[PDB]
Design a protein around this nucleic acid. Sequence first.
DNA 1: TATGTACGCCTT
DNA 2: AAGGCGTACATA
Lengths: 175, 175, 84, 82
Amino acid sequence: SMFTDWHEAAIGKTHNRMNFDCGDADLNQFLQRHARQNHEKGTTKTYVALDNSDVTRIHGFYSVSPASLIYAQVPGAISKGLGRYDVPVFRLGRLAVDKSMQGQGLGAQLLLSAGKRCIQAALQVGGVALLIDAKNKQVCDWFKGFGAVPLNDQPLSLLLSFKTLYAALSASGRL
Amino acid sequence: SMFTDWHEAAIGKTHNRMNFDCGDADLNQFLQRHARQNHEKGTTKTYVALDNSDVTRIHGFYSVSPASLIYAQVPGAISKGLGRYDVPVFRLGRLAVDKSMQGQGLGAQLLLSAGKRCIQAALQVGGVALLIDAKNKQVCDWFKGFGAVPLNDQPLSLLLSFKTLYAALSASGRL
Amino acid sequence: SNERLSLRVSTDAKKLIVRAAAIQQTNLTDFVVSNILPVAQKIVDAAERVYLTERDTKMIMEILDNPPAPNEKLLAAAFALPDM
Amino acid sequence: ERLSLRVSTDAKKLIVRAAAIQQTNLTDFVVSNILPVAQKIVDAAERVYLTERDTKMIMEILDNPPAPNEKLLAAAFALPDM
DNA sequence: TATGTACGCCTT
DNA sequence: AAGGCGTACATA
Ligand SMILES: CC(C)(COP(=O)(O)OP(=O)(O)OC[C@H]1O[C@@H](n2cnc3c(N)ncnc32)[C@H](O)[C@@H]1OP(=O)(O)O)[C@@H](O)C(=O)NCCC(=O)NCCS
Ligand SMILES: CC(C)(COP(=O)(O)OP(=O)(O)OC[C@H]1O[C@@H](n2cnc3c(N)ncnc32)[C@H](O)[C@@H]1OP(=O)(O)O)[C@@H](O)C(=O)NCCC(=O)NCCS
Ligand SMILES: [Ba+2]
Ligand SMILES: [Ba+2]
């Protein structure tokens, strides 16, 4: 069923990026050429699912960065209580599985793993939701299957609340 | 000594604001002519402690508003993990207790009350701590008694994290 | 990502702004926006932002990473707090 | 590379005078001040401007979030303890 | 009814 | 491809 024989780590010098191919040119290029520079020197962080036997083999990765939702003025909100102009979220910008491991539920686990990582970080820096970047309708439909909700405008973006994610991780005992 | 025969409300029409005197003119003046307008038009929300017997009598009040801490360029912290540079907090900008009952622990309870309200709002708009403005060193020392930590390069401002306040609130069953 | 803006102003005010735009050797938009954005950001900053030094950044990052336990005064207040 | 710019006489003189006040030459002054600005801009969190309709929807989702469904829960229980 | 948002034209 | 102007229509 679901492949569970992997562990997570921040991308480092040890990991075998060149052997990683997910069938999408741009995601491959990010992991192979840009992930490490952005991780060590920037706000975009990249985490890889590593095989448990050969611990340099990348089965997949996701990248996350900080973002803010700027609410528009809406009738009734000011009275409704405390608000904020810029609501903090984490953008799940990239999520990819190696072709040799697709169809085994690793994509779904990486999404929960990105949620877990963002909730834990949000405890120290703020955040209420994952904002998810979908390449196309098919990817969007895939994320929607997990309960992410597409934005009406800028429709290749979905929102998955930390509350929803937290309930799932709590129940399983991961948080 | 902890007075508990009071209840919290958002500032309203029926509350006698002119009887309130805490020994500070600005706080008194803010409550009398400004607290109301900002509460339903602006960003600062004001909540009043009201006597259970005389529901129009104000024993005290506090005002809270969203703010952000802008972190500086700290070495070795970029790569340290998932983070962001604008960290949401809530500012406890005003806290006052009517002179008729200073010394009965209402101020400490309004502090906990403010932390609870902000923790709840932070579930929807983000937030990790209370940022407390003290008007002088005595007030600042008072807040430090509850575990708030003064800023080094901004004394008179203190930070009280939501984890500390949550730990107190859950322990007493208020959250 | 572009927008637009339209301010009804008085006729005498417009002469002022053109002469000042002229003396500054720029066009109307440049003068108005380059002078109003600094005022605007200074306003949101003082209201909604606290710019931390490196020392306070490192202090606060430590607090938020490992926050102190609630103390006796904070607990006494939490147990006093009534729930309605 | 190089930065080639056309600046008014009043602007050039003001940069010259300030560089002078700062006991530093004209290249280190402009450059040493503008990278920290530039660094702050690129490290800042991306801003996502919502329409009115999306604000309403997002506020409602953050107010009343949906429960985790079967696919999310299944993924959660498969997730390894790291 | 008084902004402010919108049509837009038109050169630079 | 933007600094400007004209001018009617959507909102407290
Ligand atoms: C999408 C992806 C991450 C899923 O990884 P996965 O491990 O296949 O995800 P799971 O195995 O957990 O569930 C995948 C299921 O949905 C289907 N699916 C996933 N993405 C799909 C897509 N883009 N189009 C069509 N079907 C898709 C798979 O066929 C599979 O069906 P099954 O598992 O029911 O047999 C993976 O296919 C991938 O790496 N795609 C390239 C990365 C990518 O497209 N990223 C887009 C945003 S960065
Ligand atoms: C700070 C304040 C809220 C405390 O109210 P409280 O919680 O009811 O006071 P406490 O129960 O904490 O006990 C405070 C101690 O100092 C004393 N005290 C309280 N307020 C005092 C005052 N305004 N002047 C002098 N002594 C005071 C109390 O009698 C007690 O003394 P004890 O140590 O002998 O018991 C109250 O002083 C006040 O409203 N001051 C107005 C100005 C202000 O609050 N500024 C803060 C925003 S910067
Ligand atoms: Ba491969
Ligand atoms: Ba009185």
